[PDB]
Swiss-Prot record:
It comes from Homo sapiens (Human). Activated by phosphorylation by specific MAP kinase kinase kinases such as MAP3K1/MEKK1, MAP3K3/MEKK3, MAP3K11/MLK3 and MAP3K12/DLK. It is found in: Nucleus; Cytoplasm. The DVD domain (residues 377-400) contains a conserved docking site and is found in the mammalian MAP kinase kinases (MAP2Ks). The DVD sites bind to their specific upstream MAP kinase kinase kinases (MAP3Ks) and are essential for activation. The D domain (residues 37-57) contains a conserved docking site and is required for the binding to MAPK substrates. GO terms for molecular function: ATP binding; enzyme binding; JUN kinase kinase activity; magnesium ion binding; MAP kinase activity; MAP kinase kinase activity; molecular function activator activity; protein kinase binding. One of its GO terms (cellular component) is cytosol. This is Dual specificity mitogen-activated protein kinase kinase 7. Dual specificity protein kinase which acts as an essential component of the MAP kinase signal transduction pathway. Essential component of the stress-activated protein kinase/c-Jun N-terminal kinase (SAP/JNK) signaling pathway. With MAP2K4/MKK4, is the one of the only known kinase to directly activate the stress-activated protein kinase/c-Jun N-terminal kinases MAPK8/JNK1, MAPK9/JNK2 and MAPK10/JNK3. MAP2K4/MKK4 and MAP2K7/MKK7 both activate the JNKs by phosphorylation, but they differ in their preference for the phosphorylation site in the Thr-Pro-Tyr motif. Its cofactor is Mg(2+). Ubiquitous; with highest level of expression in skeletal muscle. Isoform 3 is found at low levels in placenta, fetal liver, and skeletal muscle. Residues 19-244 form the Protein kinase domain. Interacts with isoform 1 of VRK2. Interacts (via its D domain) with its substrates MAPK8/JNK1, MAPK9/JNK2 and MAPK10/JNK3. Interacts (via its DVD domain) with MAP3Ks activators like MAP3K5/ASK1 and MAP3K1/MEKK1. Interacts with MAPK8IP1/JIP1, MAPK8IP2/JIP2 and MAPK8IP3/JIP3 scaffold proteins. Interacts with RASSF7, the interaction promotes phosphorylation. Found in a complex with SH3RF1, RAC1, MAP3K11/MLK3, MAPK8IP1/JIP1 and MAPK8/JNK1. Found in a complex with SH3RF1, RAC2, MAP3K7/TAK1, MAPK8IP1/JIP1, MAPK8/JNK1 and MAPK9/JNK2. ATP binds at K43.
Length: 265
């Protein structure tokens, strides 16, 4: 559907002029619905833009509109189609995990990465089983969080060893090591090919053992960083890992932690 906004459970007859532009975020606009006061994220696709960009934007929007039943994927509130533009209203999140790392200026606690791991794995498992989509780029910039504790996947250096000669599991492990240590494991590489050489030649950058990380966390990262892809576990096997099982039920106040980090300059 187009020309309608669905915030919560109320559908609103809306047009693009019913939204107030509050500025650009990081092209995704922050806009306010004048009829209710809701602030939403709006992605603008110009019909005169690049054909390559508009091709993938329409492709992911197809998946986004099909992912209304997944609580770990950014939801679409509606679309506005004009004679020159396509505005995609999206659920407004707080910030991405990469900004949280830079704002923290240090490692992100394991309990936060535990809830983050459960959310991201279930999002990737949803894209594969129900949509046949394999998200070929999982990184902290694609992991979104808000002030209510939600952790969702955004869009659809981290390439798996076999993707060069499943593959997304390797990208999640690299992201977990980067957030758990505050250091990108391939930060000393100048070119993209130098990162490539170290992934195949060097041992997997595992989690350090002197930071109080639980054995379940280090085991989950080691399983994600398996160089031989034939021995890398499935999402079916990952979802039963004790690290996933712990944070599927453990109460972690991600909302309060998110506010505390955002309250720093
Ligand atoms: C670290 C991440 C970061 O800084 N960002 C860049 C600036 C915008 C930030 N941000 N993105 C979203 C967002 C984007 N999408 C999205 C929807 C559809 C498609 C396609 C290709 O169809 C692509 C992206 N959904 N959500 C944000 C939201 N929703 N809230 C807050 N900030 C957001 C990411």
């Amino acid at each position: 559907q187009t020309g309608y906004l669905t915030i919560g459970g109320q559908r609103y007859q809306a047009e693009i002029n019913d939204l107030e532009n509050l500025g650009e975020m990081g092209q995704v606009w922050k806009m306010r619905f004048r009829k209710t006061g809701h602030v939403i994220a709006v992605k603008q696709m110009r019909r005169s833009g690049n054909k390559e960009e508009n091709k993938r934007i329409l492709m992911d929007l197809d998946v986004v509109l099909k992912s209304h039943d997944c609580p770990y994927i950014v939801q679409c509130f509606g679309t506005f189609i004009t004679n020159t533009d396509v505005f995609i209203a999206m659920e407004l999140m707080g910030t991405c995990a990469e900004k949280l790392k830079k704002r923290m200026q240090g490692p992100i606690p394991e309990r936060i990465l535990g809830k983050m791991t459960v959310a991201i794995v279930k999002a990737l498992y949803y894209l594969k089983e129900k949509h046949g989509v394999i998200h070929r780029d999982v990184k902290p910039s694609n992991i979104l969080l808000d002030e209510r504790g939600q952790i969702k996947l955004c869009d659809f250096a981290y390439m798996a060893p076999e993707r060069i000669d499943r593959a997304d599991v390797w990208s999640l492990g690299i992201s977990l090591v980067e957030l758990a240590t505050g250091q990108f494991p391939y930060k000393k590489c100048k070119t993209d090919f130098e990162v490539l050489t170290k992934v195949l030649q060097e041992e997997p950058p595992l989690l350090p053992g002197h930071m109080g990380f639980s054995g379940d966390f280090q085991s989950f990262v080691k399983d994600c960083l398996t160089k031989d892809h034939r021995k890398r576990p499935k999402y079916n096997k990952l979802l039963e890992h004790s690290f996933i099982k712990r944070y599927e039920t453990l109460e972690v106040d991600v909302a309060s932690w998110f506010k505390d980090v955002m309250a720093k300059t």
